[model samples]
Target: GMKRVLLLFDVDGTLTPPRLCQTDEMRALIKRARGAGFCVGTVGGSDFAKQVEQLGRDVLTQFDYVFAENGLLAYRNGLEIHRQSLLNALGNDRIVKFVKKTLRLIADLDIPVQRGTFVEYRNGMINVSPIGRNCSQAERDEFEVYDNEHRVRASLIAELENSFPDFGLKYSIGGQISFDVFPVGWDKTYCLQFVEDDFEEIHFFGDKTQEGGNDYEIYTDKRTIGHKVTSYKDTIAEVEKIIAMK
Candidate 1:
């Protein structure tokens, strides 16, 4: 067994389906990894309480840390390690202006369905959603289907990037139907700050490594060997391969 190992994971589509709870099978897999002397934690686009909710507070012992909001917020040993806000990081006055403009632009877009909330600001990133994160599971499904047909997030990303490239912002598809906006270096790569000196080997697991996906930067970073998966089943299989290596 390895003495010093760090295993980082992305939440949605990696350990569980988007906006869903972790399965019993997934828990067992993570338990085995922790039992085998690996330090495991989640680095996700979602927030802290949300991660705890989806992964279960009962399984808290399985995690060594929780990195949320694209590494905008995190904790270890029940202590806050880091918390940042993109709005402040960029500039409050300038950011509020964009939020207004961006919100209006998103609202004007043609989509099949509408949900309650959109353009949420996490300290480290801004979540821009066409269908809104406040939807029911049924509404989420509708948005997912509509997104596939319309390529909505992609279109907005191109528009946003072109309009704001000089501002040093970056964009990524943080979820199935939403994208994230934050400063250039504020990404899953931001989590590396907590582990750069500790582990001899590092493994990062994520669902979004495609060019426009939020995890793409870290997945392609020099510090980690990234594993991309389509579902929790694939993550287990990937881990099984990692721990069984000759």
Candidate 2:
């Protein structure tokens, strides 16, 4: 193994089951990446804690870097490097009314149950859930079909930005059931700033690389070569491919 390039990643469905602790196989591969001289890092939409849980808190010590909360914040060596993010950013009367409309529309569409924890505001973005974030794995399965049958999540984000011109917002299908809304240019691309010139090239892996996907901007950026992976098995293969190239 050789470590000439910086290897970056997106968590969630790409690395884990919407989530992580270091497993033996995964841990061994991470060790191999380090041994080969590839610097590893991750940019995730979840909070820093969840990111750490997915990748491993040790990723910080590996000294590549980790950007979380949709690149609204960053960490290094297990410590927060900077956190200049938007909080309590936006939610007006119109937005509130929009939420009501969204709920009614969902009801009208009869998209099963809400479950719970419908909307949450993270450091730099609003996490909107269609079937609720609290749904168990089994409950989530039911919502999964319903969600796929009707992709209602994307509409509100678009509607919100259109309704409020000054909102200057960006929206994307974040993960399986939720959507992430943030100010334009504030998505995962922010992680690119951390890559030093020493690396030969940057390689990024993400689950959401399509247009209107949360991982789209950074993954599609020219700064790094991006791989679109659909599952953990695919991600494992991708990691193997990188190591082979080394």
Candidate 3:
């Protein structure tokens, strides 16, 4: 096969459990893919530090491309190549106005436990959480259970969408604790621009590929051969199948 294939993975559920570390098996498969002459990359909704926390300290070298916050922060060949800013995309005044409303809404939400860091400002997007970003493991689990029954995150997004209808923002529900808010068309597709021309075939694997989910845009992008996987084990099976297409 002469195709220069690139295997692009979504870090959260696809590579590892949600908000968890990368499994040794997934790490080996990535290394094996590169050895098989296939390039590998990762795209995630979280910032670079959070990506590192889950992926590993050697993440920069582990994958040929590492895109944090949907490639707002990008690295290639263990070097930083590109970076985008939400602050520049939306002015300071607009951001403060939006944050103030979001925080107020969170305050009004009648949740069981509310922790700190409810709104996190990242390089490319702001992560909004109803139960707060700094919740303990037990608290997070509890919120996820509560949210499923109450649709807390979904309800929050609907309100934000209504209030800031003209803000040109996209709200994506990701992880267990938070949702990401970035400009429209700035989803995972933002990272594809860098890899599109370089690779002939791009295979993307992710868990949440449905509409309104974080991976929807890129998964359904015409450029990628998307595989909607359920978990890391599913990803391993999918990746193995691709690696064998020599």
Candidate 4:
């Protein structure tokens, strides 16, 4: 049999509604992809465990791999194979100090901000959310509404990039009103290179590939196939077309 094409799916905006749950059709498509011998995986900004839980048993078990936290963590066959955490290298002292100083600076400017726990705190690397962590859909929507036009959120990211040159942190927008700060070398494009070495053809599906979006790096990569999804329901059709072409 021919080696099946590999498909890397982004969950939140690609398979399900933004800030919403997954759908039955999406789950079935995932299962179908696995059954067809395609190397299936999920690459997203959500927590690795959270994505697995959201995908649930039926869908999660079908995947060969999971790239979570926007490629900060990777798993294969239900076991973590590769992982990198920037906070792990930066240490808590430096991270906390940086956070405090940055927050204070932003606060001095009276920017509307909320701080959340560092996700995957290891080394000196830290992922901080100015909008707080684990926010509910309603809260996230409200936060985005509040920060939308002024681009306060974007400005905050830009400021961080500008202020912390030594830290080498790179910013990418995550779920609603959230930003992922990782080491300079880490991003979806680098993760795709990892996937490419293992799979035949890597196809990335995502919604937000515009400038500064988390998935933008992955979408812009020339080696991988990029599918930009505007509507959640459209993913099924897109996946079907990809499969049919094979």
Q: How far is candidate 2 from the true structure (C-alpha RMSD, Å)?
A: 3.6
> How many pairs collide in each candidate, listed in order?
2, 4, 0, 16
Comparing 1 and 3 on lDDT, the stronger one = 3
Give the range of the ten consecutive residues with the poorest summed lDDT in model 2: 101-110
Model 1 agreement with the true structure over 86-109: per-residue lDDT tens digits: 756788876887688778778888
Residue 64 miss distance in model 1 (angstroms): 0.4
For residues 37-135, could you state the per-residue lDDT of candidate 4 as single tens digits?
Answer: 678778876666567566775444667777776666777767777777555667667677677765665564443555554243432234555566666
Which candidate achieves the best lDDT against the true structure? 3
For candidate 3, write residues 2-80 as lDDT tens digits: 3499999988788987768998898899888898889989998988887788988889889999999999999998999
Q: What global local distance difference test value does model 1 have?
A: 0.80
**Could you tell me the TM-score of candidate 3?**
0.96
Model 2: lDDT equals: 0.70
Candidate number of the best TM-score? 3
Q: Is candidate 1 or candidate 4 better by TM-score?
A: 1
